[PDB]
Amino acid sequence: DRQPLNPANIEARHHGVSDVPRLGAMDADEPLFVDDYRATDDEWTLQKV
């Protein structure tokens, strides 16, 4: 949105369970359903290159 999503109240995502809001919140801009911060620097570099 117009604001940077540095507040960590924004991002969360429940995966593989019954979460009818996060499906209903598709095409919404704020909450940014992301899986995990699994991307360490090795695969981050590999993704980049």
Partner: protein, 63 residues
Amino acid sequence: KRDEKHRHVVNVVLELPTEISEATHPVLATMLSKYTRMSSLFNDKCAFKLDLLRMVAVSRTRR
């Protein structure tokens, strides 16, 4: 009673035809108690179908 309420859910919201209901489906029979406490969001009927699909997916997963 709540039987007609579940019927209203599975016909208006979830849009199922008359073959599948609570008798032939235990996973739907467990998930309707989740769905009935979500009074709003009943205009987005597609998300309810999708969550029903993924509940059938977790019903038949092998990992």
